[PDB]
Amino acid sequence: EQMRLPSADVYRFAEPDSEENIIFEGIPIIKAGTVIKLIERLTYHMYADPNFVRTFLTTYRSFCKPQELLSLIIERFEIPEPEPTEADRIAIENGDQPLSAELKRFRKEYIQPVQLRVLNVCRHWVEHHFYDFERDAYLLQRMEEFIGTVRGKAMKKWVESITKIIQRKKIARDNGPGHNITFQSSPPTVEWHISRPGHIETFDLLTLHPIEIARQLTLLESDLYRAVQPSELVGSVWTKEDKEINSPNLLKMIRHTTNLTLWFEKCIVETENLEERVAVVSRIIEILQVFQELNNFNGVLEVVSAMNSSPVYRLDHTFEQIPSRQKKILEEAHELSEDHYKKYLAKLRSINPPCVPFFGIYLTNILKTEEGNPEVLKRHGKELINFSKRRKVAEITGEIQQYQNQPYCLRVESDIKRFFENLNPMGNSMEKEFTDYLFNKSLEIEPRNPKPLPRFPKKYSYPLKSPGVRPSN
Ligand SMILES: Cc1c([C@@H](C)Nc2nc3c(c(=O)n2C2CC4(COC4)C2)CNCC3)cccc1C(F)(F)F
Incomplete structure (x- = not known):
């Protein structure tokens, strides 16, 4: 039948x-x-x-x-x-x-x-x-x-x-995004260092407060992480010709990672004076330290990627002066990635919210x-x-x-946000050309061992001393 x-x-x-x-x-x-x-x-x-x-x-x-x-x-x-x-x-x-x-x-x-x-x-x-x-x-x-x-x-x-x-x-796509998190506790005070509130023209790596850099990059990366839809990743669509249509949030995440990582490298190798360059590397490890306190694993491994990069990793004279305890922070961050991400995955699955996973x-x-x-x-x-x-x-x-359901109890600072959204270290250069420039700049500031180490003039006029990573209170 x-x-x-x-x-x-x-x-x-x-x-x-x-x-x-x-x-x-x-x-x-x-x-x-x-x-x-x-x-x-x-x-x-x-x-x-x-x-x-x-x-x-x-x-x-x-x-x-x-x-x-x-x-x-x-x-x-x-x-x-x-x-x-x-x-x-x-x-x-x-x-x-x-x-x-x-x-x-x-x-x-x-x-x-x-x-x-x-x-x-x-x-x-x-x-x-x-x-x-x-x-x-x-x-x-x-x-x-x-x-x-x-x-x-x-x-x-x-x-x-x-x-x-x-x-x-x-109706929702007509209206657009809105504000939809009341803070469930009081967020901490925004931290400020050399740059004054509003005075965006002075905003830079060493002039914003390291805590606030780390917090604002975490809020930004949290939103980027949360905006990725699954279908953006299926089929390798972000590598195909219609990538901009099929993978918009994914590509925003990837380009942010590329731009933040290369901006860290740029800050390092364009500071030609050794002592200033040590203060820069040290400030970036402080930002890493705050990323790890926030469990922004995405930001930890962006710092690691920058410190392991071709132009930066070879800077032995710079890293010699980094304090031993900051070397240990950076070593531990690297060890997250070792052995197919073993310690990373273990930590990811054991922490409580909020976090930003490594994307x-x-x-x-x-x-x-x-x-x-x-x-x-x-x-x-x-x-x-x-x-x-x-x-x-x-x-x-x-x-x-x-993990896309984990808002941070942190206040947005609109100008610092916009400063990090608008990072463009490459300029109008292509990536390969820019990273070749970075590696050449590395060879200039610390030549290969047989050649001697020149001195270079200072470029920063404000104090290099960090305010540290303990907040107010
Ligand atoms: C710790 C540190 C780094 C970290 C991020 N890299 C790193 N650390 C470690 C291992 C390793 O293989 N690497 C690099 C070597 C590569 C391969 O070529 C790059 C991965 C192995 N296991 C122990 C920790 C970068 C720059 C300066 C330092 C500092 F000054 F602190 F020592």
Whole structure:
């Protein structure tokens, strides 16, 4: 009795499971499938599958376009009803209403179930991935068209649910971001050093207070971390040609990291006087120290990256003068990264909020997953989409997400914020050219051992003494 399901002449989502169309790894977990089998199982009539819905909608762009998805789920929804029996045909021939017994049960046990799973996909799509519709107005047109042409008593509650979500997201992106954290305790006083409040023209590494540099960079990096959406990381989309559209928050995070790291390097090697340069390196290790007190691991490893860089790491005469206890701070920070990040991961998972995780490790691990797993599995001459590959990426993005909920009890200083948002150490140079300049500047200020060490004039007119990293109170 196969003929209860609709035929392949009329419906593409009812062909049998085979080893040529679906591989699996309780609700079953799919390893690989054709897109039709993935859509079918996304909307399967016998059970709901919230883990697969979530993971599919996070990752589908690596195997299917949004417009193709919408077409496929609409096609999924439009199930053909079976032909009436000879007796039902006789009934309507006689002028009567037919009994319709199988038609009624097929509606109950197939059509309605599938259709409510399609509307659930729509709801999850608009609720958690509204960006696809912000990025494509015609996709939003199609969605609203499809949703307003869904008729029926059982469907209309969903149509409401979806329409109301679509209203909220349109209203929210019209309004923009707002202030949505009341401080749950009193934040500490903003710290100031040489630069006076408002006097932004004097803002620099040594002239702002090291505590406040570290706090304001932590607030900034916290917001950047929190703004990354999972799909920005799937498929390596931030390395592809449409990176600026598909990965905006991700690329903001990456470019911030690049600009802060290179700015630290620039501050160091452009201070040619040894003693001033020691005070600069020492101030950066103080900022590191405050990053670690805040559990901004992102900022700790940006300082580490700068201290391990080509231009900076070779500056033996500078590091000789750094106090032993600041050397120990810097050594411990480096040891976070050793052995595949062992101590980092242990500390991450044991602290209480708030923190900023190191973002670079997630990129590294996602790239390894992307490069170490095939896009397709071949079975019997057919290519199936490797869905396990996407699930493994989605699980890494879910680790990201678990820490995106950790606001700091720190007050924003708008001008210091803007100073760090507007860091541009490279200028109009390309990265490679800029880092070649940095390395050449390093060789100038501390030549390779056979050549002697010149002295260089001082460049800072204010005192080099730090105020330290203990706050007021
Ligand atoms: C501690 C320190 C650093 C840290 C960030 N780098 C560092 N530290 C350590 C290890 C290591 O391999 N590295 C560098 C060497 C590389 C490979 O080429 C760079 C990673 C190994 N285990 C013990 C700690 C940088 C500059 C000046 C110092 C200071 F002056 F304090 F000693």
